[PDB]
Design a protein around this ligand. Structure first.
Ligand SMILES: *[C@@H]1O[C@H](CO)[C@@H](O[C@@H]2O[C@H](CO)[C@@H](O[C@@H]3O[C@H](CO[C@H]4O[C@H](CO)[C@@H](O)[C@H](O)[C@@H]4O)[C@@H](O)[C@H](O[C@H]4O[C@H](CO)[C@@H](O)[C@H](O)[C@@H]4O[C@H]4O[C@H](CO)[C@@H](O)[C@H](O)[C@@H]4O)[C@@H]3O)[C@H](O)[C@H]2NC(C)=O)[C@H](O)[C@H]1NC(C)=O
Ligand SMILES: *[C@@H]1O[C@H](CO)[C@@H](O[C@@H]2O[C@H](CO)[C@@H](O)[C@H](O)[C@H]2NC(C)=O)[C@H](O)[C@H]1NC(C)=O
Ligand SMILES: *[C@@H]1O[C@H](CO)[C@@H](O[C@@H]2O[C@H](CO)[C@@H](O)[C@H](O)[C@H]2NC(C)=O)[C@H](O)[C@H]1NC(C)=O
Ligand SMILES: *[C@@H]1O[C@H](CO)[C@@H](O[C@@H]2O[C@H](CO)[C@@H](O)[C@H](O)[C@H]2NC(C)=O)[C@H](O)[C@H]1NC(C)=O
Ligand SMILES: *[C@@H]1O[C@H](CO)[C@@H](O[C@@H]2O[C@H](CO)[C@@H](O)[C@H](O)[C@H]2NC(C)=O)[C@H](O)[C@H]1NC(C)=O
Ligand SMILES: *[C@@H]1O[C@H](CO)[C@@H](O[C@@H]2O[C@H](CO)[C@@H](O)[C@H](O)[C@H]2NC(C)=O)[C@H](O)[C@H]1NC(C)=O
Ligand SMILES: *[C@@H]1O[C@H](CO)[C@@H](O[C@@H]2O[C@H](CO)[C@@H](O)[C@H](O)[C@H]2NC(C)=O)[C@H](O)[C@H]1NC(C)=O
Ligand SMILES: *[C@@H]1O[C@H](CO)[C@@H](O[C@@H]2O[C@H](CO)[C@@H](O)[C@H](O)[C@H]2NC(C)=O)[C@H](O)[C@H]1NC(C)=O
Ligand SMILES: *[C@@H]1O[C@H](CO)[C@@H](O[C@@H]2O[C@H](CO)[C@@H](O)[C@H](O)[C@H]2NC(C)=O)[C@H](O)[C@H]1NC(C)=O
Ligand SMILES: *[C@@H]1O[C@H](CO)[C@@H](O[C@@H]2O[C@H](CO)[C@@H](O)[C@H](O)[C@H]2NC(C)=O)[C@H](O)[C@H]1NC(C)=O
Ligand SMILES: *[C@@H]1O[C@H](CO)[C@@H](O[C@@H]2O[C@H](CO)[C@@H](O)[C@H](O)[C@H]2NC(C)=O)[C@H](O)[C@H]1NC(C)=O
Ligand SMILES: *[C@@H]1O[C@H](CO)[C@@H](O[C@@H]2O[C@H](CO)[C@@H](O)[C@H](O)[C@H]2NC(C)=O)[C@H](O)[C@H]1NC(C)=O
Ligand SMILES: *[C@@H]1O[C@H](CO)[C@@H](O[C@@H]2O[C@H](CO)[C@@H](O)[C@H](O)[C@H]2NC(C)=O)[C@H](O)[C@H]1NC(C)=O
Ligand SMILES: *[C@@H]1O[C@H](CO)[C@@H](O)[C@H](O)[C@H]1NC(C)=O
Ligand SMILES: *[C@@H]1O[C@H](CO)[C@@H](O)[C@H](O)[C@H]1NC(C)=O
Ligand SMILES: *[C@@H]1O[C@H](CO)[C@@H](O)[C@H](O)[C@H]1NC(C)=O
Ligand SMILES: *[C@@H]1O[C@H](CO)[C@@H](O)[C@H](O)[C@H]1NC(C)=O
Ligand SMILES: *[C@@H]1O[C@H](CO)[C@@H](O)[C@H](O)[C@H]1NC(C)=O
Ligand SMILES: *[C@@H]1O[C@H](CO)[C@@H](O)[C@H](O)[C@H]1NC(C)=O
Ligand SMILES: *[C@@H]1O[C@H](CO)[C@@H](O)[C@H](O)[C@H]1NC(C)=O
Ligand SMILES: *[C@@H]1O[C@H](CO)[C@@H](O)[C@H](O)[C@H]1NC(C)=O
Ligand SMILES: *[C@@H]1O[C@H](CO)[C@@H](O)[C@H](O)[C@H]1NC(C)=O
Ligand SMILES: *[C@@H]1O[C@H](CO)[C@@H](O)[C@H](O)[C@H]1NC(C)=O
Ligand SMILES: *[C@@H]1O[C@H](CO)[C@@H](O)[C@H](O)[C@H]1NC(C)=O
Ligand SMILES: *[C@@H]1O[C@H](CO)[C@@H](O)[C@H](O)[C@H]1NC(C)=O
Ligand SMILES: *[C@@H]1O[C@H](CO)[C@@H](O)[C@H](O)[C@H]1NC(C)=O
Ligand SMILES: *[C@@H]1O[C@H](CO)[C@@H](O)[C@H](O)[C@H]1NC(C)=O
Ligand SMILES: *[C@@H]1O[C@H](CO)[C@@H](O)[C@H](O)[C@H]1NC(C)=O
Ligand SMILES: *[C@@H]1O[C@H](CO)[C@@H](O)[C@H](O)[C@H]1NC(C)=O
Lengths: 136, 472, 136, 136, 53
C-alpha cells in the first residue's frame, strides 16, 4: 500500500512489512532504454553518462548480493541467522528497538559495529559448512 | 533479553548522502521536431509517462543548497554540450583581416510604427569592407558587410578596424541548422539512488525540511541562460522568497524568487537580410546584407504597474531581514557587458538590455500610497554577434543574423541582487541593492534547490528471536 | 540430446528435459576474448561495440537472476511454489498444456498476467519469511 | 590467521580453514572511488583504464556465481554434491589429497577433466529438480 | 654582461652555441606581416642553402 521509501518514517515494527517495495527497485530503471532516436551517438556527452549509470546500477546491486551469498541468506528477504547479539552493540530492550525506533535511527547507532557484525556473520556460516562436511 | 539473535532484513528504507551520475531524460513530444537542439538533444532516454512521487510522512532531512553537487554536474553538462555543438562548425580565421569601416545610409518608411519612439539602428551599425584578390595583378575587389559597433575595434590608422576576437581566440560560426530553444531536461539517477525533494512552501536555502518526498528524477528544467533576471522558468508556491548563502556577507549574491510571473516582451523591429560569402574551400560565411525598410532600436516592453507592485512586495520581504534600513535599488555600478546589461537569447539573437528604469527607485516609509497611470516601460537593448558566453571556459561563437522580425515573450520569475557594504551609515540607515552579478550557477540553484541525491542501503541487521534451524 | 534452442518446437513436456542447454549460455560468450592483437584501442569503432556487448551480457543475466532471488528460487532450475493457479490466467487442463503446446505459445497466452504473477510470487516468498520469523 | 592468499602454500586440508579470506575480496577494491578531484573527464587515459577495471571485476565475480547457481550451491561456501567420484579423474586416496597436496597442485592435476565435471555437476542438479516435481 | 661570469667550473660559455635568428610571422590579422628575432640553440636549426639562412 506504500510507495518506494514510503515507510522511512514508520517504526521498525511497522516498516518491515513493506520490505519488498524497496527491494524490487535495485536494478529496474529508465536507463536501460536506448534513446529518443538512434555524430557518434554512443560517445555523446549524454551517451557516456548513460553508460556509467548502467555500471553504477549493476555494481550497487552486486554489493548487497555479495554479502547475502556469504551469509547464507541467498533467496530470502528476512533471513534468521545463528549469531548471538551480545548486547555490546546495543543494550536496548526488544520493546524499545521495534516500537519507537525507525530503520534510519537504528542503523546510525550501530553504525560503529557493522564492520564487525559483517565479519562475524560470515564466520558463523563458514563454521556451519565445515560442521556438515564431517557430519554427513 | 538473553535469547536474541542477529537477523538480516534485505530491503529496509535506509539511505545515506552520496554523489552520483545523473543521466538525462526528456519527453518525446518536445523533441522529434528534427530541429537538432543544442542542449536537450535526442540522446536523452524517453522519460516515464507517469512520474511517481512518494510522501515520507515522519521524515526530516537536512537539505543544503549552496553545497549541492547537482549544480556542478549541470554546469559541466551545459559546457560540454556547448563545446560539442560548435565543434563541426566553420572557423572564422579568414575574417581576421583589415576592415575599412564607415557610416550607414539607410532609407525607410516614415511612420515606422512610432509607438516607442526610441531611436534608429544607425550610429550602432557600420559598413565594413575588405579586399579580395583578383586575376589582374595589384587589383582588389571590395567585399561589404554590416557589423555592429560592439564587434569591431579600431587598432591604428583610423578608419581601419578589425574584429574584436582576433587577438584573444578563434571563433566558430554557429551552424544555422541547430536551434537555441531550451527544451526541458529531467535529471534521472541510476537504480539504487533516489532524489529527495522538499515540499515545504516557505523554505529557505539550508536546514531541516519536514515534508520530504521521494522522486525518481526531477521535473522539466530549462537550461535558459540570463544574467540580471532569472527568466522564463518556475514560480514559487508560498510567497516571494529571498535566499542567499549568508545575508551578512555582501560578497554573496541574493536570489529573489517570485510567486507571480511578470511578462517581458522583447522585439527587434528591424529588417535584416542575409548574404553568404565563401571563405576558404567549402566553408561559407553568413553576413548581414542590408537593412531595408523599418529601422529602429530593438526594445523590450514591460507592464509598469506589475513590476511596480512586484518591487513593492520584494521590498516588503527584504525589509524583514534588514529591519530599520530603507531599501533602494540602484542600477549596476560597472563590469563587463553581461553584468551591466541584462543579457539573454531570443530566437538565436543575443540581446543586452539596459534595465535602469526597472532598478532605480527608493522605498522610505510607505507614508502615502501614490497612485499612477497604466504605463509601459521600454528598455532599449543592443544586439551582439561575437558572443563569449562564458568568460574563459567556453568556446567563442559567431551568431549568424536571422532574417525578418524577432519577438520573444518571456516570464520574469527571479531577480539577482548584490548588496553594498556601507560602514559609517549608522545614522543614515539605507541599503542599496544592485542587479546582476553572480556566475551562471545561480541560474540553476533556482531550480535544483529542492532536490538532494541519496543512495539506498537496503541491507539491515536487527535482533529477533529467530535461531537458524541446524540441519541433522 | 539437443543444442541451443534445439527443442523450441517440441511440446512443453519434452522441451523441459533440456533446460540446461539453454541455461549454460547466459553469460559465456566470445566477447570475453581480447582481440586479434593488442591509438587508444579501447576507443576504436570495433572497440566500443565490444564494451557495450559486455554490459548487455551482464545486465540480461541479472534481470532474470534478480527475480529468482526474490521468489526464493536462487540456485534452482525448477522451483516449486505455494502460489495457486486461479485459472483466470489460463483455464486449460493439465494434458492440454504439457502435451499440446510449445513454450513459445504458452508464454503468449499468459503475457497479460506475467506482470501480476511476478507480484504474487514476490509476496508469497515475503509471507513465508514473516510467518517464519514470528514462529521460531 | 592469514591474509589474502596467505595460505597458498599450505596443504589442502589445512588451507581450507581460510576460504572466507579469499572469498571476501572478489568485488571489493579501490576502483569504486571517483577520483582525486572531478574536458570530459570520463575519456581521460585513466578514465578508461578505470571504467574497464569496474567491468572486469563484475564479470570475474559473475563467472563463478553462475556455476554456483546451476549446481545448487548458492549462498554456501562449502557445498556437498550427490556426484560420485569415479577415480579416473584422480584415484589418490583420502590421505594423499587432504594431507599431502596443495590446492594449486591439485587443481593442476585434474585440469583435464574440469570441463566435464562442470557438465556432470550441472546435469545432476537438474535431475534432482525433476525428481521433486514428480514427488511433491 | 659581466666580465668575470664567476668562472669557478671554467668549462666555457654559451657564446658560439646560440644564434640570433630573425624571421617573418603574421600578426593576429593575416594580411600584415612582422619581423621577429629569437635566440635559437644551434642544435635546433639546420643550414639548408643560400648560406647564412
Ligand atoms: C521562454 O519560453 C517560451 C516558450 O517556450 C519562448 O517563446 C517561444 O520561443 C520559441 C523559440 O525561442 C519560438 O519558436 C519559434 O517561433 C518562430 C516564429 O513562428 C511564427 O512565424 C513562423 C513564420 O516565420 C510560422 O511558421 C509560425 O507558425 C509562427 O507563426 C518560428 O519560426 C520558429 O520555428 C523554428 O523552430 C521550430 C521548432 O524548433 C522548427 O520546427 C522550425 O522549422 C523553425 O526552425 C528553423 O530555424 C531553426 C533555427 O532557429 C533551424 O535549425 C531549422 O532547421 C529551421 O530552419 C520557432 O517555432 C516561439 O514562437 C516562442 N513563443 C511565442 C509565444 O512567441 C521564449 O523564447 C522563452 N524565453 C527565452 C528567453 O528563452
Ligand atoms: C507518523 O507519526 C505519527 C505519530 O505522530 C503516526 O501516527 C500514529 O500511528 C500509530 C499507528 O498507525 C497510531 O497508533 C497512533 O495513534 C498515531 N498517532 C497519531 C497522533 O496520529 C503515523 O502513523 C506516522 N506515519 C508513518 C507513515 O509512519
Ligand atoms: C518512545 O520514543 C520516545 C521518543 O522517540 C522516547 O521518549 C523520549 O525520551 C527522551 C528522554 O530519553 C526525551 O528527551 C524525549 O523528549 C522523549 N520523546 C518525546 C517525543 O517526548 C521513549 O523513550 C520511547 N519509549 C521508550 C519505552 O523508551
Ligand atoms: C554601405 O555602403 C555601400 C556603398 O557606399 C552601399 O551599397 C551601395 O548602395 C548604393 C545605393 O545607392 C548602390 O548604388 C551601390 O551599387 C551599392 N554598392 C555596392 C558595392 O553594393 C550600402 O547600401 C551601404 N550599407 C548600408 C546602407 O547598410
Ligand atoms: C506536506 O506537503 C504536502 C504536499 O505539498 C502538502 O499537501 C498540500 O497541502 C496544501 C494545503 O491546502 C494543498 O493546497 C496542496 O495541494 C497539497 N499538495 C498537493 C500535492 O496536493 C502538505 O500540506 C504538507 N504538510 C503536511 C503536514 O503534510
Ligand atoms: C505572493 O507573495 C506575496 C508576499 O508578500 C503575497 O503578498 C502578501 O499576501 C498576503 C495575503 O493577502 C497579505 O496579507 C500580505 O500583506 C502580502 N504581502 C505584502 C508585502 O503585501 C502575495 O499574496 C502572493 N501572491 C500569490 C499569488 O501567491
Ligand atoms: C508584444 O509586443 C508586440 C509588439 O509590440 C505585440 O504585437 C503587436 O500587438 C498589437 C496589438 O495591440 C498589434 O496591433 C501589432 O500589430 C502587433 N505587432 C506585430 C509586429 O505583430 C504583442 O501583442 C505583445 N505581446 C504581449 C504579450 O505583450
Ligand atoms: C498592466 O497591469 C495592470 C495591473 O494588473 C493591469 O490592470 C488590471 O486590469 C485588470 C483587467 O481585468 C483589472 O482586473 C485589474 O484590477 C487591473 N489592475 C489594477 C491594479 O487595477 C493592466 O491591464 C495591464 N496592462 C495590460 C495592457 O493588460
Ligand atoms: C542605460 O541607460 C542609462 C540612461 O540612458 C545610461 O545612463 C547614462 O549613461 C551616460 C553615459 O555615460 C551618462 O552620461 C548619463 O549621465 C547616464 N544617465 C542618464 C540619465 O542618461 C546607462 O549608461 C545605460 N547603460 C549602459 C550600460 O550604458
Ligand atoms: C508565464 O506566466 C503565465 C501565467 O503564470 C503562464 O501561463 C500559465 O501557465 C501554466 C503552466 O505553465 C498554466 O497551468 C496556466 O493555465 C497558464 N495561465 C494562463 C492564464 O495562460 C505562462 O505559461 C508563463 N510562461 C512560460 C513560458 O512559462
Ligand atoms: C514435431 O512434431 C511432430 C508431430 O507433430 C513430431 O513427430 C513425432 O515425433 C515423435 C518422436 O520421434 C514420434 O514418436 C511420433 O511418431 C512423430 N509423429 C509424427 C506424426 O511423425 C516431431 O518429433 C516434432 N519435432 C520434435 C523436434 O519433437
Ligand atoms: C611449509 O612447510 C612446513 C614443513 O612441512 C610447515 O611447517 C610445519 O607445519 C605443520 C602444520 O602445523 C606443523 O605441525 C609442523 O611442526 C611444521 N614444521 C615441520 C618441520 O613440519 C609449514 O606450516 C608450511 N607452511 C605453511 C604456511 O603451512
Ligand atoms: C621579412 O620580410 C622583409 C620584407 O618583406 C624582408 O626584408 C627585405 O627582404 C628582401 C629579400 O630579398 C630584401 O631584398 C630587402 O632588402 C629586405 N628589406 C628590408 C627593409 O629588410 C626580410 O628579408 C624578410 N625576412 C627573411 C628572413 O626573409
Ligand atoms: C561483543 O561484541 C563487541 C563488538 O565490538 C566485542 O568487542 C565484544 O568482545 C563482544 N563480547 C563478547 C562476549 O563476545
Ligand atoms: C546501555 O549502555 C549505556 C552505555 O553503555 C548505559 O548508559 C545504559 O544505562 C545501558 N542501559 C541498560 C538498560 O543497560
Ligand atoms: C561511534 O564511534 C564514534 C567514533 O568516535 C563515536 O564518536 C560515537 O560516539 C560512536 N557512537 C555513535 C552512536 O556514533
Ligand atoms: C535616425 O535618428 C537620428 C537621431 O539623431 C535622426 O536625426 C535621423 O533623422 C534618423 N533617421 C536616419 C535615417 O538617420
Ligand atoms: C531557514 O529558516 C528556518 C526557520 O525559519 C531557520 O531555522 C534556518 O536557520 C533558516 N536558514 C537560513 C540559512 O537562514
Ligand atoms: C523585409 O525584407 C524583405 C527582404 O529580406 C523584404 O522583401 C520585405 O518587404 C521587408 N519587409 C517586410 C515587412 O517583410
Ligand atoms: C511606479 O511607476 C512610476 C512610473 O512608472 C514611478 O514614478 C513610481 O515611483 C513607481 N512606484 C513607486 C512606489 O516607486
Ligand atoms: C528599529 O528601530 C526602532 C526605533 O528606534 C526600535 O524600537 C527597534 O528596536 C529597532 N529594531 C527593530 C528590529 O525594529
Ligand atoms: C535614478 O538614479 C539616480 C542615480 O544617482 C538617482 O540620483 C535618482 O534619484 C534615481 N531616480 C530618478 C527618478 O532619477
Ligand atoms: C494619466 O494620469 C492623469 C492624472 O489624473 C490622468 O488625467 C490621465 O488620464 C492619465 N492617462 C493615462 C493614459 O492613464
Ligand atoms: C485470479 O485472478 C483474479 C484477477 O483479478 C484475482 O482477483 C483472483 O484473486 C485470482 N485468484 C485467486 C485465487 O486469488
Ligand atoms: C491438441 O493439439 C492440436 C494441434 O495443436 C489442437 O488442434 C487440439 O485442439 C489440441 N487438443 C486439445 C484438447 O486442445
Ligand atoms: C567416470 O568416468 C567414466 C568414463 O570416463 C564414466 O563412465 C563415469 O560415468 C564417470 N563417473 C561419473 C560419476 O560420471
Ligand atoms: C591409479 O591410476 C594410475 C593410472 O591409471 C595407475 O597407474 C594406478 O595403479 C592407479 N592406482 C590404483 C590404486 O589402482
Ligand atoms: C591432460 O591433457 C594434456 C594435453 O595434451 C595431456 O598431455 C595430459 O597427459 C593429460 N592428462 C594429464 C593428467 O595431464
Ligand atoms: C666566452 O667564450 C669566448 C670563446 O672564444 C671567449 O673568447 C670569451 O672570453 C668568453 N667570455 C666572454 C665574457 O665573452
Amino acid at each position: 500500500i506504500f510507495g518506494f521509501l514510503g515507510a522511512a518514517g514508520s517504526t521498525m515494527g511497522a516498516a518491515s512489512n513493506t520490505l519488498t517495495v524497496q527491494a524490487r527497485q535495485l536494478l529496474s530503471g529508465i536507463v536501460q532504454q536506448q534513446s529518443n532516436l538512434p555524430h557518434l551517438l554512443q560517445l555523446t556527452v549524454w551517451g557516456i553518462k548513460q553508460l556509467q549509470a548502467r555500471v553504477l546500477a549493476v555494481e550497487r546491486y552486486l554489493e548487497v548480493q555479495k554479502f547475502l551469498g556469504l551469509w547464507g541468506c541467498s533467496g530470502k528477504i528476512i533471513c534468521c541467522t545463528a549469531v548471538p547479539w551480545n548486547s555490546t552493540w546495543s543494550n536496548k530492550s526488544f520493546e524499545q528497538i521495534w516500537n519507537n525506533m525507525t530503520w534510519i535511527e537504528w542503523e546510525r547507532e550501530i553504525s560503529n559495529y557493522t564492520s564487525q557484525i559483517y565479519d562475524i556473520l560470515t564466520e558463523s556460516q563458514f563454521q556451519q559448512d565445515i560442521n556438515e562436511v564431517d557430519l554427513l | 533479553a538473553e535469547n536474541l539473535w542477529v537477523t538480516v532484513y534485505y530491503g529496509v528504507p535506509v539511505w545515506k548522502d552520496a554523489d552520483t551520475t545523473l543521466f538525462c531524460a526528456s519527453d518525446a513530444k518536445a523533441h522529434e521536431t528534427e530541429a537538432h537542439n543544442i542542449w536537450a538533444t535526442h540522446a536523452c532516454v524517453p522519460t516515464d509517462p507517469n512520474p511517481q512521487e512518494i510522501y515520507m510522512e515522519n521524515v526530516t532531512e537536512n537539505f543544503n543548497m549552496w553545497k549541492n553537487n547537482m549544480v556542478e554536474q549541470m554546469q559541466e553538462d551545459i559546457i560540454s554540450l556547448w563545446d560539442q555543438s560548435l565543434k563541426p562548425c566553420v572557423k572564422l580565421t579568414p575574417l581576421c583581416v583589415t576592415l575599412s569601416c564607415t557610416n550607414v545610409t539607410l532609407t525607410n518608411v516614415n511612420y515606422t510604427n512610432n509607438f516607442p519612439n526610441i531611436g534608429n539602428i544607425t550610429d550602432e551599425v557600420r559598413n565594413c569592407s575588405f579586399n579580395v584578390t583578383t586575376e589582374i595583378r595589384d587589383k582588389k575587389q571590395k567585399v561589404y558587410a554590416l557589423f555592429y559597433k560592439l564587434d569591431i575595434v579600431q587598432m591604428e590608422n583610423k578608419n581601419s578596424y578589425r574584429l574584436i576576437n582576433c587577438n584573444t581566440s578563434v571563433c566558430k560560426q554557429a551552424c544555422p541548422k541547430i536551434s537555441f530553444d531550451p527544451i526541458p531536461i529531467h535529471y534521472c539517477t541510476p537504480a539504487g539512488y533516489a532524489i529527495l525533494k522538499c515540499n515545504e512552501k516557505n523554505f529557505n536555502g539550508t536546514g531541516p525540511c519536514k515534508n520530504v518526498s521521494s522522486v525518481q528524477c526531477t521535473h522539466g528544467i530549462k537550461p535558459v541562460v540570463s544574467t540580471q533576471l532569472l527568466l522564463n522558468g518556475s514560480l514559487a508556491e508560498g510567497e516571494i522568497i529571498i535566499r542567499s548563502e549568508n545575508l551578512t556577507n555582501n560578497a554573496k549574491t541574493i536570489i529573489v524568487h517570485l510567486n507571480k510571473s511578470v511578462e517581458i516582451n522583447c522585439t527587434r523591429p528591424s529588417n535584416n537580410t542575409r548574404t553568404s560569402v565563401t571563405i576558404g574551400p567549402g566553408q561559407v560565411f553568413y553576413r548581414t546584407g542590408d537593412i531595408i525598410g523599418d529601422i529602429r532600436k530593438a526594445y523590450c516592453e514591460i507592464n509598469g504597474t506589475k513590476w511596480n507592485e512586484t518591487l513593492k512586495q520584494v521590498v516588503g520581504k527584504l525589509k524583514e531581514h534588514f529591519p530599520n534600513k530603507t531599501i533602494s535599488f540602484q542600477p549596476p555600478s560597472g563590469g563587463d557587458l553581461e553584468i551591466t546589461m541584462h543579457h539573454f537569447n531570443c530566437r538565436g539573437e543575443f540581446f543586452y538590455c539596459n534595465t535602469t528604469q526597472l532598478f532605480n527607485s527608493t522605498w522610505i516609509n510607505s507614508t502615502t500610497i501614490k497612485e499612477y497611470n497604466d504605463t509601459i516601460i521600454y528598455l532599449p537593448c543592443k544586439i551582439k554577434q561575437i558572443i563569449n558566453m562564458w568568460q574563459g571556459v567556453g568556446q567563442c561563437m559567431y551568431a549568424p543574423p536571422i532574417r525578418g522580425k524577432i519577438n520573444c515573450v518571456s516570464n520574469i520569475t527571479g531577480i539577482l541582487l548584490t548588496r553594498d557594504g556601507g560602514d559609517a551609515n549608522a545614522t543614515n540607515d539605507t541599503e542599496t541593492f544592485r542587479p546582476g552579478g553572480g556566475n551562471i550557477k545561480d541560474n540553476w540553484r533556482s531550480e535544483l534547490y529542492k532536490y538532494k541525491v541519496v543512495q539506498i542501503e537496503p541491507l539491515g541487521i536487527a535482533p529477533t528471536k529467530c535461531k537458524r534451524r541446524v540441519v541433522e
